[PDB]
Amino acid sequence: HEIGQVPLLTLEEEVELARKVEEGMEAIKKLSEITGLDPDLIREVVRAKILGSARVRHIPGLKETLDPKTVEEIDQKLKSLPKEH
């Protein structure tokens, strides 16, 4: 019943939604190419915002992961890029 809440997509919506992700996936590289940071890492620090209102895990993998003050500093470098990057 939670599952019936979300509706089917158009033969155009399906397409259009997918096109954002492939580019986003490229963009992620494009960033890691310029930043020198890692594709796997950027993808986290980006998710840690779109999802990470709280999603930034309660305990950062018992300090395997880092989720404290560290997240911003990365997204702070990503905000502090020149406009074309």
Partner: protein, 57 residues
């Protein structure tokens, strides 16, 4: 000014704001692959005139 309506395909996407500036050496609607579909010929304004759906927020 001279009107001319181009048909945007299902598998396509526009890269133009709500009636913004359009140059002669520009591309308006991106396609599946660059077919001879949408390349700008002359200066003017592109007007959006049939969305398939509408999102209110």
């Amino acid at each position: 000014t001279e009107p001319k309506d181009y048909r945007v395909q299902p598998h396509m996407n526009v890269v133009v704001p709500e009636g913004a500036r359009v140059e002669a050496g520009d591309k308006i609607v991106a396609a599946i692959d660059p077919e001879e579909e949408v390349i700008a010929e002359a200066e003017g304004v592109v007007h959006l005139h049939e969305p398939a759906s509408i999102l209110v927020v």
